[PDB]
Amino acid sequence: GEELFTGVVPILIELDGDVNGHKFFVRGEGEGDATIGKLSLKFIATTGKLPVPWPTLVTTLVQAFSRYPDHMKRHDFFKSAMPEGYVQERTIYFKDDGTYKTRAEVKFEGDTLVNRIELKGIDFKEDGNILGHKLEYNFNSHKVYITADKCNNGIKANFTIRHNVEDGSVQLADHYQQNTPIPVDLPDDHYLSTQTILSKDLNEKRDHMVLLEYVTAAGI
Amino acid sequence: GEELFTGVVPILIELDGDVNGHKFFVRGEGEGDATIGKLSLKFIATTGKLPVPWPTLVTTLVQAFSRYPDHMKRHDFFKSAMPEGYVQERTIYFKDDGTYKTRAEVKFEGDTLVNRIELKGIDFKEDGNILGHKLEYNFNSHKVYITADKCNNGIKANFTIRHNVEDGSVQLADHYQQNTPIPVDLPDDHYLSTQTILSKDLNEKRDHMVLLEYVTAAGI
Structure with missing residues (x-):
């Protein structure tokens, strides 16, 4: 388990998507340090310019990298599932617009943690904030x-x-998560607070997103 | 649910057995009164003299008739499952001898509560207390x-x-029960204490058993 997350762990993330029939694929590489809760990743849209805004993929696209304080070590479900892994199922509803469903397997392969994800989006509106690409490049x-x-x-x-939307208005997205393993651990109610920075590789020519996160657990 | 168990409810019990390959069938008729916790039943071995002693079938052969005191009404799982019914799975291990597995569906049919049961017994010893018929006609x-x-x-x-065994020694039989329904109820740890009388219809010519029980719940 968490014996694995001392020091820096390299990351591979792969996402197979289809939203309203618009298929796309994203591969991410980078590294995380769960002892301070840092993620740094670059994502590449291998299929061409994405049919959806990058910010909507952020949640779906390795919480196992959250910094859990020493007083909270009994509640780190994510890390206790390793190296075998866990499954992460999500349903995401975008206010007054469509919805995502995600299933992902999060494992170790060699020394890298890998997140392989399937995403299906339905019922979205064009000229809506998602398909119409109106979201600020923010998180x-x-x-x-x-x-x-x-x-x-x-x-x-x-x-x-x-x-955030260009207009000035805000697009809500309700998340619903299930996680299940692939010995055991289980944690009393607490939360992860996260902070994200989205930017771009200036020498990169493909549709891409570089991402930097800090995540810590709290509330005990 | 328990709206059904005020006053007397007639009973039909049916058991399909096979123990060490010895097949048999038992049908029971009688009546229960859950407001005082009484059962009176007559059982008939339709296939001929039983391959096993009658007392070993008693547990496997309608707890929904237990008298639950008013202060315990929130814990009557059996009756809350009615009229739809429940499933009762049991594993029974006889000390130093074979084991039974039972599955039964307990429902209302018309005005009668019916217990339809399948029983399979394996690994029994002849000259053992079960197949060798050494158990007192007691419960x-x-x-x-x-x-x-x-x-x-x-x-x-x-x-x-x-x-009780003829010898004077006692035959133990560990029971393990699961019950599941066919809106809901669920009860805090308590027990049913029971008392049984086994006797025989003197004008009856088939291998049979008449049974009389009183069951009440307690321990809160």
Whole structure:
């Protein structure tokens, strides 16, 4: 388990998407340091300019990298599932627009943590904030509320993302999370607060996104 | 639910058995009164003289008839499952001898409560207390410990039966129970204490058993 997350761990993320029939693929490489809770990643849209804004993929596109303080070590479900891994299922509803469903397997391969994800989006509106590409290239700080469902030997989480829109208005996105493993751990209600920076490689020519996160757990 | 168990309810019990390849069938008719916790039943071995002693079938052969005191009404799982019914799975280990597995569906049909059961027995010894027919035609009083497993939206119970043997020695039989429904109810740990009388219809010519029980719940 967390014996693996001392020091820096390299990362591979892969996302297979389709939204309203618009198929796309994203591969990410980078590294995380769970002892301070840092992620630095570059993502590449291999299929061409994305059919959806980059910020909507951020949540779907390795919480196992959250810094859990020493007084909270008994509640790190993500890391206890390693190296075998866990499954992360999400349903995301965008206010007054469409919805995503995600399934992902998060494992170790060699020395890298890998997130392989499938995404399906339906019922979106064009000239809506998603397909119409109206979201600022931003990601504000959020809290992620975790509770452990004993029955499924895992956790549940839910939280809503606030996406800034060009207009000045905000696009809401309700998240619903299930996590299940691939010995055990389970954690009392707490949350992850996160902070994200989105920017771009100036020498990169493909549609891409560089990402930098800091995540810590709290609330005990 | 328990709206159904005021006053007397007629009973039909049917058991399909096979133990060590010895097949048999038992049908029971009688009536119960859950407001005082009485059962009176006559059982008939339709296939001929039983391959096993009658006392070993007693537990496997309608706890929904237990008298639950008013202060315990929130814990009557059995009756809350009605009229739709529940499923009762049991594993029974006989000390130093074979084991039974039982699955039963307990429902209302018309105005009768019906218990339809399948039983399979394996690994028994001849000249053992079961196949060798060494058990006294007795049934002592026992406690039945119930706990509610939330996950399976039902209960679990376990208890051991003490069968008197002709020899003077006692045959133990560990029971393990699962119950699941066919809106809901679930009960805090308590038990059923029971008392049974076994006797015979003197004008009856088939291998048979008449049974009389009183069952009440307690322990809160």
